[PDB]
Design a protein around this motif. Structure first.
Motif, mmCIF file in Angstrom:
data_model
loop_
_atom_site.group_PDB
_atom_site.id
_atom_site.type_symbol
_atom_site.label_atom_id
_atom_site.label_comp_id
_atom_site.label_asym_id
_atom_site.label_seq_id
_atom_site.Cartn_x
_atom_site.Cartn_y
_atom_site.Cartn_z
ATOM 1 N N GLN A 1 0.845 -1.167 0.000
ATOM 2 C CA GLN A 1 0.000 0.000 0.000
ATOM 3 C C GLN A 1 0.902 1.245 0.000
ATOM 4 O OE1 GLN A 1 -0.383 2.402 2.480
ATOM 5 N NE2 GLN A 1 -1.975 3.312 1.239
ATOM 6 N N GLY A 2 0.527 2.237 -0.784
ATOM 7 C CA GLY A 2 1.177 3.542 -0.689
ATOM 8 C C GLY A 2 2.476 3.639 -1.457
ATOM 9 N N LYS A 3 2.882 2.599 -2.196
ATOM 10 C CA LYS A 3 4.206 2.601 -2.829
ATOM 11 C C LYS A 3 4.176 2.980 -4.283
ATOM 12 C CE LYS A 3 6.065 1.393 0.858
ATOM 13 N NZ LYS A 3 7.113 2.245 1.488
ATOM 14 N N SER A 4 3.223 2.412 -5.000
ATOM 15 C CA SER A 4 3.202 2.617 -6.420
ATOM 16 C C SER A 4 2.363 3.865 -6.752
ATOM 17 C CB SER A 4 2.608 1.431 -7.111
ATOM 18 O OG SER A 4 2.696 1.582 -8.516
ATOM 19 N N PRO A 5 2.887 4.720 -7.653
ATOM 20 C CA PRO A 5 2.002 5.629 -8.330
ATOM 21 C C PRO A 5 1.070 4.862 -9.208
ATOM 22 C CG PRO A 5 4.198 5.744 -9.321
ATOM 23 C CD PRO A 5 4.282 4.889 -8.092
ATOM 24 N N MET A 6 0.109 5.604 -9.750
ATOM 25 C CA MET A 6 -0.825 5.080 -10.719
ATOM 26 C C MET A 6 -0.241 5.359 -12.079
ATOM 27 S SD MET A 6 -4.921 5.742 -11.140
ATOM 28 C CE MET A 6 -5.295 5.311 -9.429
ATOM 29 N N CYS A 7 -0.077 4.319 -12.896
ATOM 30 C CA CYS A 7 0.741 4.422 -14.080
ATOM 31 C C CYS A 7 -0.126 4.227 -15.324
ATOM 32 C CB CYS A 7 1.932 3.432 -14.081
ATOM 33 S SG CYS A 7 2.833 3.272 -12.542
ATOM 34 N N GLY A 8 0.073 5.074 -16.346
ATOM 35 C CA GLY A 8 -0.525 4.933 -17.705
ATOM 36 C C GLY A 8 -0.402 6.229 -18.499
#
Ligand code: U5P
Ligand code: U5P
Ligand code: U5P
Ligand code: U5P
Ligand code: MN
Ligand code: MN
Lengths: 183, 183
Positions: free
Chosen positions: B101-108
């Motif tokens: 939780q809380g680590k990845s940005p939202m990517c696209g």
């Protein structure tokens, strides 16, 4: 100005707010900067702190009244007579001299958060921009994974106001232009 | 499956919607892919075409009636019994399995826009991500200005289906990783 109206110029902006959710929160400060495609600061627009009543200024989050307190901001909002529709008219106007419409993305660090507040409260200023963002924090996340020594050159800056911040974003992207991109 | 849980794993997503305005429009499809920090695809999440009524499907914006018509999405949404509630719960559980939780940005590509829908409609799922976005279109905008020739190697595809759109984002970023970043 020979550069004014150049298709490739970029509109950079930061906002300060009363908090993180537009439904509740409002815009306190706003600053703009225009750069050329190579990141040379071409021109500034207005730096408005917005007029907000003491009920609003007293009901921000605990982060917000503590940091906008110690950095005479909440006091600048009280003492301000600037309206949100007047910040918008003066914000748009400044921008429109410099770039054609729908050319520049909206540029900044986590600029999508700012674009949420722009989209609701300042919807006609938003309409000048390309639908894309140029989010410097995307590159930071790539740097953290792909070349994190590069982060050593990035100037952090303790401040939390709209010109300090935006200027800090431009200069972050400059560092990446020099040490992270291959051009 | 060895890489499950690594702090630096990226969550990639693409949504299709009834239109560009969250206020009135809703989610019709979501696809998620996990990659490692280097962009090796680690897992494909479950794809969902979200159940909508004939009332919603017949009165979305005309771009959508045509392209979702064309693509077999409009029809997948007719036959689907999938509620947004289930899609949300399942997508959260998938992503929890692969990244803390809380680590990845939202990517696209132009991912801030999909975040608007996730924020309004799948708040629990949004809560998994870091607040930041990893927007491939930010780097496309920089390549346009700084090294436009790189875009010749970027592969475009006509599909406007979540899965195909996200694989294409990942691949575009792989092209920049090689041609545009100095690793
Ligand atoms: O921990 C934080 C950090 C920032 N903000 C909000 O984000 C806005 C923009 O922040 P920044 O430009 O200082 O990052 C601030 O004015 C404030 O409303 C918070 O609510 N909590
Ligand atoms: O918990 C937080 C802390 C900050 N911000 C927002 O993140 C941005 C700071 O950008 P970055 O440079 O850290 O990515 C600001 O717009 C601020 O409002 C959040 O949304 N959530
Ligand atoms: O010209 C367009 C482009 C996109 N969209 C909306 O944005 C969504 C996501 O776009 P994409 O992933 O297919 O690019 C589509 O499902 C559709 O609702 C439109 O309405 N018209
Ligand atoms: O005319 C358009 C075309 C696309 N989009 C949005 O931008 C995304 C495509 O991003 P990009 O790859 O062009 O940056 C779509 O998913 C859609 O939501 C728009 O807002 N307006
Ligand atoms: Mn900011
Ligand atoms: Mn999309």
């Amino acid at each position: 100005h020979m550069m004014a109206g150049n298709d490739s110029n970029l509109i950079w902006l930061d906002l300060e707010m009363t908090g993180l959710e537009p439904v509740e929160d409002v815009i306190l400060e706003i600053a703009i900067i225009i750069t050329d495609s190579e990141l040379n600061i071409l021109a500034q627009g207005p730096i408005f702190a917005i007029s907000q009543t003491d009920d609003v200024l007293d009901n921000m989050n605990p982060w917000c009244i503590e940091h906008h307190g110690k950095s005479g901001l909440t006091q600048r909002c009280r003492d301000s007579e600037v309206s949100l529709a007047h910040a918008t008219k003066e914000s748009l106007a400044f921008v429109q001299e410099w770039v054609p419409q729908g050319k520049s993305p909206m540029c900044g660090n986590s600029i999508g958060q700012d674009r949420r507040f722009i989209n609701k409260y300042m919807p006609d200023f938003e309409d000048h921009f390309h639908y894309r963002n140029l989010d410097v924090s995307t590159i930071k996340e790539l740097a953290k994974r792909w070349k994190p020594e590069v982060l050593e050159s990035v100037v952090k800056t303790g401040a939390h106001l709209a010109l300090d911040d935006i200027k800090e974003s431009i200069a972050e992207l400059k560092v990446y232009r020099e040490l992270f991109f291959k051009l």
